[PDB]
Amino acid sequence: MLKKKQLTVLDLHPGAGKTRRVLPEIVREAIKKRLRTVILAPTRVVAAEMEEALRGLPVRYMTTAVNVTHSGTEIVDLMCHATFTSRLLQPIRVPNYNLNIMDEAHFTDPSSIAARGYISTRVEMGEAAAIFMTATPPGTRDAFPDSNSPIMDTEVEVPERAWSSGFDWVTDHSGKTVWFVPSVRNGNEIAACLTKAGKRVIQLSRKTFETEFQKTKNQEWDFVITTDISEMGANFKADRVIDSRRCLKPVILDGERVILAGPMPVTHASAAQRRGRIGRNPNKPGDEYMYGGGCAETDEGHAHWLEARMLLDNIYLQDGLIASLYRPEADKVAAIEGEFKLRTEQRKTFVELMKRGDLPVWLAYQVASAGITYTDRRWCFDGTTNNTIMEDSVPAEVWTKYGEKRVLKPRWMDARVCSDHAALKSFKEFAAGKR
Ligand SMILES: CCS/C(=N\c1ccc(CC)cc1)NC
């Protein structure tokens, strides 16, 4: 695997030992061969689990999720997928790693797709080797792969709202369940229904993941209600997965707005990953997987692939060349390579709106390409009446940095800035000039 050119896809089934068994062997060989190596973790939780599997080995942890006193002589760096992509975009020089290892290489967030694009392009140019570790490579059509122990698979109607009757099997269970819901708001309703029935529930989503995940180890629970973020290496000591088989899909309409379409079917890769949370202990056969819908290729036309192109167009590769998306996932978007390339100043605004502004990639691009500077928030208020953001059935209001009370009405509407209470609160703070 460890030779210039060559991208290897390590596709062992979920729980086969890619992270705890194969990864340390690869790292030992890389260090023996003096290969400058990067290990890409999807989340800070996976970064912490990787330190445990790699303990002793000289690895430089470029994350605050690990508390290690480095020696300065490490030739292996470990960082999150987003950090790698972020450093590539920023003026900081990123080493030209001879070996690029991506754990949970199926992650569909824009920064993970862009990282795959950049790395596979360097490999195609003959400059580096790469290893993509995932049980579900792009384009997988099997939602029921192998497991460490047999799983009972059952197609059943799964509630997506609070219920009074008709789903006794859900609450009659005496074990631990991980339940995948299509959104934070849908999970809040199911969590409330289960709590009212006497169950102890933990909720996980992208924003709360590190803090709330600790509770799955620190306390006794009956249910974990989670969004699709738990498909990325989140390990639970559970005996059942309930899977709605649904997700929200960001869709760019007329090149002018982003809506959260659906809920709609998950991909086969997402279903296999959700199911893959259980059946991991060869001594506990019979873990259950209850699923409530079929799979579909909902990654085609999904905004994340277009956002990945906006990122790759603004990353230096060599002269005017631009990194292409990883070949198996390149047809998911219809885009011209280079169409989102920004001049140095607008590029800096683009980066700062994502990094400091915490805006979605698509929204950051619309603001930066319009020649608007980072601190100029007049665009949050001068959109059409149909772009009015609503808070509890009434127009949302903020005090501008000037001291004026105004209705939140952005020139570009992206549904992700107000898809839950937390997102709308962060967007209100941005529109007010508070970051
Ligand atoms: C706070 C009261 S309004 C204010 N600025 C303006 C000025 C003009 C207009 C358009 C009539 C709106 C707003 N600053 C504090």
Swiss-Prot record:
| Lumenal membrane side | 1-435
Name positions with the PTM N6-acetyllysine: 207
Which intervals hold domain Helicase C-terminal?
150-329
Subcellular location(s): the record lists:
Host cytoplasm; Host endoplasmic reticulum membrane
Maturation and modification: Acetylated by host KAT5. Acetylation modulates NS3 RNA-binding and unwinding activities and plays an important positive role for viral replication.
How would you describe this protein's topology in the membrane?
Answer: Peripheral membrane protein
Q: Per the record, which residues fall in region Important for RNA-binding?
A: 3-6
Q: Which residues bind ATP?
A: 12-19
Q: What does this protein do?
A: Displays three enzymatic activities: serine protease, NTPase and RNA helicase. NS3 serine protease, in association with NS2B, performs its autocleavage and cleaves the polyprotein at dibasic sites in the cytoplasm: C-prM, NS2A-NS2B, NS2B-NS3, NS3-NS4A, NS4A-2K and NS4B-NS5. NS3 RNA helicase binds RNA and unwinds dsRNA in the 3' to 5' direction. Leads to translation arrest when expressed ex vivo. Disrupts host centrosome organization in a CEP63-dependent manner to degrade host TBK1 and inhibits innate immune response. Inhibits the integrated stress response (ISR) in the infected cell.
Give the protein name, as stated in the record. Answer: Serine protease NS3
